[PDB]
Amino acid sequence: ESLFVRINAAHGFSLIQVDNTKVTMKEILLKAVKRRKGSPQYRLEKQSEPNVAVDLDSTLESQSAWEFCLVRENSSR
Amino acid sequence: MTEYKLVVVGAVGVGKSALTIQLIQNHFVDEYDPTIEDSYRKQVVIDGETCLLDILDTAGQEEYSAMRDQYMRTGEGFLCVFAINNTKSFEDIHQYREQIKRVKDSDDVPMVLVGNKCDLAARTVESRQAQDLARSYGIPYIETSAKTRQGVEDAFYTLVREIRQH
Ligand SMILES: Nc1nc2c(ncn2[C@@H]2O[C@H](COP(=O)(O)OP(=O)(O)NP(=O)(O)O)[C@@H](O)[C@H]2O)c(=O)[nH]1
Ligand SMILES: [Mg+2]
């Protein structure tokens, strides 16, 4: 099995494959938005820290987390 | 409101994700991105009665076969999908049905046999063979195209009707 991150979104969850923990949170966000919404702005939040946008330029490793919420920027989880 | 947990299963590449996204978003997914697992929730009206569909889109990749237990236990109806141009995917249908039995003690769960990609001219799985398989299981057979949307609502809505009629 590959490594993957769980993304909780407004209408379900997506498991997003990652090759390694050096992937950036930006890459994970773009994959989750593409799959769930197709062609509004979004943030990712650590599951255990509501209402705070993760730094999209940081690595997955730096988050010390494997579950995130995908939240529309004009909304809440 | 009432929520129905539907699960889409079948071999790699048969079109489980394309079927799901055609239903949910009225869009055909052209590229192949292998699934690990994804869920999609949508409010729909079936036979004049509103409900919430919770569709679980699953991995064909055998690397993720261990997941089957969790989602087969709580799944309330199953689309068992093969592709009409992929005889191996048709052969694989039985394995999904048998795993559902390992956890439900029976296969007495709403299921539809789905022959997808029927927009393609080349077919290697005969219609009569798919019909006969569904008959041997006591379940409907529905031909679909996630590309043209042929049969897509029929496949998913048949599951909901079968749950409602238990
Ligand atoms: N012509 C045609 N192509 C289809 C149809 N359904 C899916 N495809 C194509 O087949 C490929 C695989 O589809 P996909 O939905 O990703 O298959 P999957 O069963 O979800 N694969 P996995 O088990 O790895 O998740 C995609 O390129 C898609 O465009 C269909 O009904 N007709
Ligand atoms: Mg898929």
Side-chain angles (χ1 to χ4, degrees), chain A residues 29-66:
Chain A
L29 190 149
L30 289 164
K31 295 198 163 153
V33 171
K34 201 180 71 234
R35 182 173 306 156
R36 302 209 56 92
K37 330 270 181 203
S39 164
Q41 288 276 101
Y42 295 85
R43 61 169 178 275
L44 290 178
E45 309 178 349
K46 289 190 195 53
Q47 194 64 32
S48 62
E49 194 170 21
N51 298 317
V52 180
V54 309
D55 179 4
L56 292 177
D57 294 327
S58 71
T59 66
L60 172 63
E61 171 171 46
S62 78
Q63 296 293 316
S64 295
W66 286 85

Tab-separated table of all heavy atoms in Angstrom, chain A residues 29-66:
chain	number	residue	atom	x	y	z
A	29	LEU	N	-3.561	19.952	-1.701
A	29	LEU	CA	-4.763	20.750	-1.943
A	29	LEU	C	-5.192	20.693	-3.402
A	29	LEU	O	-6.376	20.500	-3.705
A	29	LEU	CB	-4.555	22.207	-1.519
A	29	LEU	CG	-5.836	23.055	-1.512
A	29	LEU	CD1	-5.777	24.127	-0.456
A	29	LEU	CD2	-6.041	23.746	-2.870
A	30	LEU	N	-4.258	20.922	-4.326
A	30	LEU	CA	-4.658	20.967	-5.729
A	30	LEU	C	-5.256	19.634	-6.176
A	30	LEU	O	-6.274	19.611	-6.877
A	30	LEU	CB	-3.474	21.370	-6.607
A	30	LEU	CG	-3.097	22.846	-6.436
A	30	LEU	CD1	-1.693	23.148	-6.989
A	30	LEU	CD2	-4.147	23.783	-7.038
A	31	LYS	N	-4.664	18.515	-5.746
A	31	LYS	CA	-5.205	17.198	-6.090
A	31	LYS	C	-6.607	16.996	-5.525
A	31	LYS	O	-7.491	16.467	-6.211
A	31	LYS	CB	-4.269	16.101	-5.583
A	31	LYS	CG	-2.910	16.097	-6.245
A	31	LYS	CD	-2.177	14.775	-6.067
A	31	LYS	CE	-1.033	14.660	-7.071
A	31	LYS	NZ	0.082	13.789	-6.599
A	32	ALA	N	-6.823	17.396	-4.267
A	32	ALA	CA	-8.130	17.213	-3.642
A	32	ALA	C	-9.189	18.069	-4.316
A	32	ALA	O	-10.302	17.598	-4.569
A	32	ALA	CB	-8.054	17.522	-2.142
A	33	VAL	N	-8.862	19.325	-4.629
A	33	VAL	CA	-9.823	20.195	-5.304
A	33	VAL	C	-10.142	19.668	-6.699
A	33	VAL	O	-11.310	19.622	-7.103
A	33	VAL	CB	-9.296	21.641	-5.342
A	33	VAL	CG1	-10.182	22.514	-6.228
A	33	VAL	CG2	-9.232	22.200	-3.927
A	34	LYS	N	-9.115	19.253	-7.454
A	34	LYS	CA	-9.341	18.705	-8.792
A	34	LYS	C	-10.297	17.522	-8.751
A	34	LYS	O	-11.240	17.438	-9.546
A	34	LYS	CB	-8.019	18.273	-9.429
A	34	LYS	CG	-8.065	18.175	-10.955
A	34	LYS	CD	-6.713	17.752	-11.521
A	34	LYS	CE	-6.429	16.287	-11.200
A	34	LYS	NZ	-5.115	16.073	-10.509
A	35	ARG	N	-10.070	16.593	-7.829
A	35	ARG	CA	-10.892	15.391	-7.820
A	35	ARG	C	-12.314	15.697	-7.375
A	35	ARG	O	-13.281	15.265	-8.015
A	35	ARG	CB	-10.288	14.334	-6.912
A	35	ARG	CG	-11.122	13.062	-6.930
A	35	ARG	CD	-10.455	11.967	-6.168
A	35	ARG	NE	-9.097	11.700	-6.617
A	35	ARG	CZ	-8.173	11.132	-5.854
A	35	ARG	NH1	-8.427	10.805	-4.589
A	35	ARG	NH2	-6.970	10.889	-6.362
A	36	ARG	N	-12.458	16.459	-6.294
A	36	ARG	CA	-13.763	16.643	-5.679
A	36	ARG	C	-14.617	17.693	-6.363
A	36	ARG	O	-15.847	17.588	-6.325
A	36	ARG	CB	-13.578	17.014	-4.224
A	36	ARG	CG	-12.782	15.929	-3.504
A	36	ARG	CD	-13.168	15.876	-2.076
A	36	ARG	NE	-14.602	15.669	-1.906
A	36	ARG	CZ	-15.175	14.480	-1.775
A	36	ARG	NH1	-14.464	13.359	-1.795
A	36	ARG	NH2	-16.492	14.412	-1.604
A	37	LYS	N	-14.003	18.715	-6.964
A	37	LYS	CA	-14.748	19.808	-7.576
A	37	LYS	C	-14.514	19.979	-9.071
A	37	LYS	O	-15.242	20.754	-9.698
A	37	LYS	CB	-14.436	21.148	-6.889
A	37	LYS	CG	-14.067	21.095	-5.419
A	37	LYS	CD	-15.299	21.211	-4.517
A	37	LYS	CE	-14.885	21.185	-3.036
A	37	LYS	NZ	-15.942	20.763	-2.058
A	38	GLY	N	-13.523	19.306	-9.654
A	38	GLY	CA	-13.298	19.459	-11.080
A	38	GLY	C	-12.683	20.806	-11.427
A	38	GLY	O	-11.957	21.413	-10.634
A	39	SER	N	-12.980	21.273	-12.641
A	39	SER	CA	-12.486	22.556	-13.143
A	39	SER	C	-12.746	23.719	-12.185
A	39	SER	O	-11.825	24.458	-11.832
A	39	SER	CB	-13.125	22.866	-14.494
A	39	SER	OG	-12.963	24.233	-14.822
A	40	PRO	N	-13.878	29.785	-6.628
A	40	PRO	CA	-13.865	29.622	-5.173
A	40	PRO	C	-12.503	29.172	-4.677
A	40	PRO	O	-11.888	28.314	-5.299
A	40	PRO	CB	-14.890	28.523	-4.950
A	40	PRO	CG	-15.849	28.673	-6.076
A	40	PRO	CD	-15.016	29.091	-7.252
A	41	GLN	N	-12.036	29.749	-3.575
A	41	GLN	CA	-10.733	29.388	-3.033
A	41	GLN	C	-10.852	28.449	-1.843
A	41	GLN	O	-11.885	28.427	-1.189
A	41	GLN	CB	-9.940	30.628	-2.657
A	41	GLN	CG	-9.431	31.416	-3.851
A	41	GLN	CD	-8.132	30.863	-4.398
A	41	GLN	OE1	-8.121	30.156	-5.404
A	41	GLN	NE2	-7.029	31.182	-3.734
A	42	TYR	N	-9.805	27.674	-1.570
A	42	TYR	CA	-9.867	26.675	-0.505
A	42	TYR	C	-8.639	26.774	0.387
A	42	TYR	O	-7.581	27.251	-0.023
A	42	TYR	CB	-9.955	25.240	-1.066
A	42	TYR	CG	-11.233	24.982	-1.819
A	42	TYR	CD1	-11.340	25.320	-3.159
A	42	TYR	CD2	-12.336	24.427	-1.192
A	42	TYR	CE1	-12.503	25.105	-3.856
A	42	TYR	CE2	-13.505	24.205	-1.885
A	42	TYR	CZ	-13.583	24.554	-3.220
A	42	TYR	OH	-14.745	24.344	-3.926
A	43	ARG	N	-8.795	26.295	1.620
A	43	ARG	CA	-7.676	26.077	2.523
A	43	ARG	C	-7.717	24.636	3.011
A	43	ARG	O	-8.734	23.953	2.900
A	43	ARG	CB	-7.705	27.046	3.727
A	43	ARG	CG	-8.945	26.919	4.609
A	43	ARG	CD	-8.784	27.695	5.926
A	43	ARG	NE	-9.981	27.630	6.762
A	43	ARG	CZ	-11.010	28.457	6.630
A	43	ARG	NH1	-11.012	29.410	5.709
A	43	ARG	NH2	-12.063	28.320	7.434
A	44	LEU	N	-6.584	24.165	3.511
A	44	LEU	CA	-6.529	22.932	4.283
A	44	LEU	C	-6.324	23.282	5.746
A	44	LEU	O	-5.622	24.246	6.069
A	44	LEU	CB	-5.396	22.026	3.806
A	44	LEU	CG	-5.595	21.392	2.423
A	44	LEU	CD1	-4.363	20.564	2.075
A	44	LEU	CD2	-6.856	20.531	2.387
A	45	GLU	N	-6.947	22.496	6.627
A	45	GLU	CA	-6.749	22.604	8.069
A	45	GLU	C	-6.330	21.247	8.605
A	45	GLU	O	-6.878	20.229	8.185
A	45	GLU	CB	-8.034	23.040	8.797
A	45	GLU	CG	-8.720	24.277	8.224
A	45	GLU	CD	-10.019	24.634	8.947
A	45	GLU	OE1	-10.521	23.822	9.767
A	45	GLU	OE2	-10.539	25.739	8.687
A	46	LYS	N	-5.393	21.232	9.556
A	46	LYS	CA	-5.146	20.008	10.313
A	46	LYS	C	-6.443	19.555	10.973
A	46	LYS	O	-7.209	20.373	11.491
A	46	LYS	CB	-4.093	20.248	11.396
A	46	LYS	CG	-2.655	20.448	10.939
A	46	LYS	CD	-1.735	20.420	12.173
A	46	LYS	CE	-0.335	20.960	11.891
A	46	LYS	NZ	-0.330	22.329	11.257
A	47	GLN	N	-6.684	18.240	10.989
A	47	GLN	CA	-7.902	17.745	11.624
A	47	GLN	C	-8.035	18.249	13.059
A	47	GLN	O	-9.133	18.598	13.505
A	47	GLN	CB	-7.924	16.214	11.599
A	47	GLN	CG	-9.291	15.618	11.918
A	47	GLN	CD	-10.348	15.973	10.883
A	47	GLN	OE1	-10.051	16.122	9.703
A	47	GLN	NE2	-11.583	16.092	11.321
A	48	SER	N	-6.930	18.300	13.785
A	48	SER	CA	-6.940	18.658	15.195
A	48	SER	C	-6.793	20.151	15.435
A	48	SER	O	-6.618	20.563	16.586
A	48	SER	CB	-5.829	17.908	15.939
A	48	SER	OG	-4.564	18.283	15.423
A	49	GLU	N	-6.845	20.989	14.398
A	49	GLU	CA	-6.743	22.434	14.609
A	49	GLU	C	-7.719	23.174	13.705
A	49	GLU	O	-7.356	23.670	12.626
A	49	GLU	CB	-5.304	22.922	14.426
A	49	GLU	CG	-5.141	24.333	14.975
A	49	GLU	CD	-3.715	24.795	15.060
A	49	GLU	OE1	-2.853	24.239	14.361
A	49	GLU	OE2	-3.461	25.744	15.830
A	50	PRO	N	-8.976	23.284	14.128
A	50	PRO	CA	-9.984	23.940	13.292
A	50	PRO	C	-9.700	25.419	13.103
A	50	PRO	O	-9.161	26.098	13.982
A	50	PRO	CB	-11.292	23.730	14.068
A	50	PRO	CG	-11.004	22.575	15.012
A	50	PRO	CD	-9.556	22.736	15.371
A	51	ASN	N	-10.036	25.892	11.905
A	51	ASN	CA	-10.162	27.295	11.559
A	51	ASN	C	-8.818	27.936	11.242
A	51	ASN	O	-8.777	29.160	11.077
A	51	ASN	CB	-10.866	28.066	12.682
A	51	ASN	CG	-12.281	27.563	12.921
A	51	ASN	OD1	-13.033	27.313	11.978
A	51	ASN	ND2	-12.615	27.327	14.185
A	52	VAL	N	-7.728	27.170	11.155
A	52	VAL	CA	-6.396	27.704	10.867
A	52	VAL	C	-5.908	27.092	9.561
A	52	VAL	O	-5.834	25.866	9.431
A	52	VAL	CB	-5.396	27.416	12.000
A	52	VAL	CG1	-4.024	27.989	11.660
A	52	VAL	CG2	-5.893	28.012	13.335
A	53	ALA	N	-5.556	27.938	8.597
A	53	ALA	CA	-5.077	27.409	7.325
A	53	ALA	C	-3.650	26.905	7.471
A	53	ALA	O	-2.782	27.621	7.985
A	53	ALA	CB	-5.139	28.485	6.239
A	54	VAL	N	-3.386	25.693	6.986
A	54	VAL	CA	-2.002	25.231	6.975
A	54	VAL	C	-1.222	25.999	5.914
A	54	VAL	O	-1.782	26.504	4.931
A	54	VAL	CB	-1.888	23.708	6.760
A	54	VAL	CG1	-2.789	22.956	7.727
A	54	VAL	CG2	-2.182	23.330	5.326
A	55	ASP	N	0.083	26.122	6.143
A	55	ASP	CA	0.983	26.764	5.192
A	55	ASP	C	1.129	25.865	3.972
A	55	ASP	O	1.746	24.800	4.049
A	55	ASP	CB	2.332	27.022	5.861
A	55	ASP	CG	3.343	27.678	4.933
A	55	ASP	OD1	3.000	28.005	3.780
A	55	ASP	OD2	4.494	27.874	5.376
A	56	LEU	N	0.579	26.303	2.836
A	56	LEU	CA	0.570	25.457	1.649
A	56	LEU	C	1.969	25.230	1.085
A	56	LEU	O	2.186	24.244	0.370
A	56	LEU	CB	-0.350	26.063	0.587
A	56	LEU	CG	-1.835	26.039	0.986
A	56	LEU	CD1	-2.691	26.717	-0.073
A	56	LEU	CD2	-2.325	24.622	1.253
A	57	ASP	N	2.927	26.096	1.412
A	57	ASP	CA	4.304	25.907	0.976
A	57	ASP	C	5.086	24.945	1.860
A	57	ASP	O	6.211	24.584	1.499
A	57	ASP	CB	5.025	27.257	0.919
A	57	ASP	CG	4.452	28.180	-0.146
A	57	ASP	OD1	4.001	27.681	-1.202
A	57	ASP	OD2	4.439	29.405	0.082
A	58	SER	N	4.531	24.517	2.990
A	58	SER	CA	5.213	23.583	3.873
A	58	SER	C	5.004	22.143	3.402
A	58	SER	O	4.085	21.835	2.639
A	58	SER	CB	4.720	23.735	5.317
A	58	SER	OG	3.399	23.240	5.465
A	59	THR	N	5.876	21.257	3.874
A	59	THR	CA	5.793	19.855	3.500
A	59	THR	C	4.766	19.129	4.359
A	59	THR	O	4.448	19.542	5.478
A	59	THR	CB	7.144	19.153	3.653
A	59	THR	OG1	7.505	19.106	5.042
A	59	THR	CG2	8.232	19.881	2.855
A	60	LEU	N	4.255	18.021	3.815
A	60	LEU	CA	3.395	17.139	4.599
A	60	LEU	C	4.090	16.694	5.883
A	60	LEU	O	3.472	16.657	6.954
A	60	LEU	CB	2.987	15.931	3.757
A	60	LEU	CG	2.229	14.806	4.477
A	60	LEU	CD1	0.903	15.318	5.011
A	60	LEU	CD2	2.043	13.596	3.554
A	61	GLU	N	5.381	16.370	5.797
A	61	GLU	CA	6.128	15.942	6.979
A	61	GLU	C	6.058	16.980	8.094
A	61	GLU	O	5.886	16.631	9.267
A	61	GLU	CB	7.588	15.681	6.610
A	61	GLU	CG	8.480	15.436	7.807
A	61	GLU	CD	9.848	14.965	7.393
A	61	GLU	OE1	10.407	15.578	6.462
A	61	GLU	OE2	10.363	13.995	7.989
A	62	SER	N	6.187	18.264	7.744
A	62	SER	CA	6.204	19.324	8.749
A	62	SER	C	4.874	19.465	9.473
A	62	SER	O	4.835	20.054	10.559
A	62	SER	CB	6.569	20.658	8.096
A	62	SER	OG	5.446	21.198	7.418
A	63	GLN	N	3.789	18.941	8.898
A	63	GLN	CA	2.475	19.033	9.515
A	63	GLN	C	2.288	18.051	10.658
A	63	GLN	O	1.449	18.301	11.533
A	63	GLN	CB	1.383	18.794	8.471
A	63	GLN	CG	1.371	19.859	7.401
A	63	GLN	CD	0.964	21.201	7.958
A	63	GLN	OE1	0.019	21.292	8.737
A	63	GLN	NE2	1.691	22.251	7.585
A	64	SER	N	3.037	16.946	10.667
A	64	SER	CA	2.853	15.888	11.665
A	64	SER	C	1.382	15.496	11.765
A	64	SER	O	0.813	15.370	12.856
A	64	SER	CB	3.402	16.315	13.023
A	64	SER	OG	4.803	16.485	12.961
A	65	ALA	N	0.761	15.312	10.601
A	65	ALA	CA	-0.655	14.997	10.510
A	65	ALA	C	-0.925	14.280	9.195
A	65	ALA	O	-0.225	14.486	8.200
A	65	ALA	CB	-1.527	16.252	10.618
A	66	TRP	N	-1.957	13.439	9.203
A	66	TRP	CA	-2.306	12.641	8.038
A	66	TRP	C	-3.774	12.779	7.691
A	66	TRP	O	-4.265	12.059	6.807
A	66	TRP	CB	-1.933	11.174	8.280
A	66	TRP	CG	-0.469	11.025	8.182
A	66	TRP	CD1	0.445	11.226	9.167
A	66	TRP	CD2	0.270	10.713	6.998
A	66	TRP	NE1	1.716	11.039	8.675
A	66	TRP	CE2	1.635	10.721	7.344
A	66	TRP	CE3	-0.094	10.413	5.682
A	66	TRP	CZ2	2.640	10.433	6.421
A	66	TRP	CZ3	0.903	10.131	4.771
A	66	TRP	CH2	2.254	10.147	5.141
